[PDB]
Amino acid sequence: MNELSKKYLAKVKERHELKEFNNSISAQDNYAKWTKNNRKLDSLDKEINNLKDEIQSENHH
């Protein structure tokens, strides 16, 4: 697998794992940690969306 896909998988998975972890934290009892995680998810989401577009364009016909 090319490094591009290797990384897309990795992130997509990092993101998933983070989401389920964050869903187990109480936003109110842990406002700071919770918020930080939300930021990292929004960030990973943008990176993922790029890697996707890049992979899709690079495989088009």
């Binding site: 997509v12 389920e20 869903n23 187990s24 934290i25 109480s26 936003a27 109110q28 009892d29």
Partner: protein
């Protein structure tokens, strides 16, 4: 006019599902507890399950008893059981075993699933909800007895119920996936076909499941939603949004509990000037809430500062969901609970 209480819901017998939610510092859980308790007291012949998916997991503190994933009777009641569950954890554990049970073939099937499922919102929330239900059934069949109504203390963040819109879009992409697989030739249809059929099947099961849920959550006699809030612009705003959202899903929402009301005019002693200042704000919005939701049951609950803990105090406090709290007569009941703390 519409009674400023939940007596109707508390005495109802048609309801199987009662969802309780509100965002952000509102007495949601206590409210859930009080509704459950009152329902059980008023319907000794039926069996209630109060379930909480709030990560704070403070059913246990509310009752002063350790609740877990296994349903368990509230101590001092024969028809109220509580259980606390983390749906994401549950779903995670489901997928760990699905993975264990199946390397290229499984990667492709995994990937194919991802490309159809990943983008769509609410999938994980539907799967999650389904696991909770399976769990409740296993609890029932294990305990040999079933629950008549579940009362759902929802998490204060996220969208528990936004997967009710899923079946429509699942149907769409089932045909997309169809159009593509219909173009596989005899050879590829041989090496892949079984996987393709499993994928289709997987999706149809989810659609059907969701549809099966949706028919229930959509029956106003079968399920309803109680919003919890406090009398402050930000909360009131979030409360309207939540109502609007719920309505978009064709869910029944008829009740609002407004908590933490000071009622400062009606108690000189427990209220310093700062409190009276605050009560004025709270009172301002109460007048608004009144003209804004006239056909709603909007139930005005008194701030019981400190924290309500124990079947006894919960019960003492929960009575006010049933018979509107009057800050004059009913005052001594509150400042009794408070002072104990």
């Amino acid at each position: 006019t519409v009674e400023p209480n939940l007596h109707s819901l508390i005495t109802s017998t048609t309801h199987k599902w009662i969802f309780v939610g509100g965002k952000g510092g509102v007495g949601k859980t206590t409210s859930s507890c009080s509704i459950a308790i009152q329902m059980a007291l008023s319907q000794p012949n039926k069996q209630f399950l109060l379930i909480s998916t709030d990560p704070a997991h403070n059913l246990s503190d509310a009752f002063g008893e350790k609740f877990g994933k296994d349903a368990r009777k509230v101590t001092g009641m024969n028809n109220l059981s509580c259980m606390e569950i983390d749906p994401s954890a549950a779903l995670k554990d489901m997928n760990d075993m699905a993975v264990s049970r199946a390397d290229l073939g499984s990667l492709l099937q995994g990937g194919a699933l991802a490309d159809l499922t990943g983008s769509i919102p609410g999938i994980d929330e539907a799967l999650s909800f389904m696991e909770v239900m399976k769990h409740i059934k296993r609890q029932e069949q294990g305990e040999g007895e079933t629950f008549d109504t579940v009362i759902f203390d929802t998490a204060p963040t996220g969208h528990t119920l936004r997967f009710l819109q899923l079946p429509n879009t699942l149907s769409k992409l089932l045909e997309k996936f169809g159009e593509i697989t219909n173009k596989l030739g005899p050879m590829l249809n041989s090496f892949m076909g079984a996987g393709n059929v499993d994928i289709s099947g997987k999706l149809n099961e989810l659609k059907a499941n969701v549809e099966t849920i949706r028919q229930q959550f959509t029956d106003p006699d079968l399920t309803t939603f109680v919003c919890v809030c406090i009398s402050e612009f930000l909360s009131l705003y979030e409360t309207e949004r939540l109502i609007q959202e719920l309505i978009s899903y064709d869910m029944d929402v008829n009740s609002i509990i407004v908590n933490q009301l000071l009622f400062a005019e009606n108690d000189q002693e427990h209220n310093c000037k700062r409190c009276q200042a605050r009560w004025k704000m709270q009172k301002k919005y109460l007048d608004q809430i009144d003209e804004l939701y006239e056909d709603f049951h909007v139930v005005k609950m008194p701030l019981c500062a400190g924290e309500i803990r124990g079947l006894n105090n919960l019960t003492k406090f929960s009575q006010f969901l049933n018979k509107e709290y009057n800050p004059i007569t009913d005052g001594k009941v509150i400042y009794e609970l408070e002072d104990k703390e």
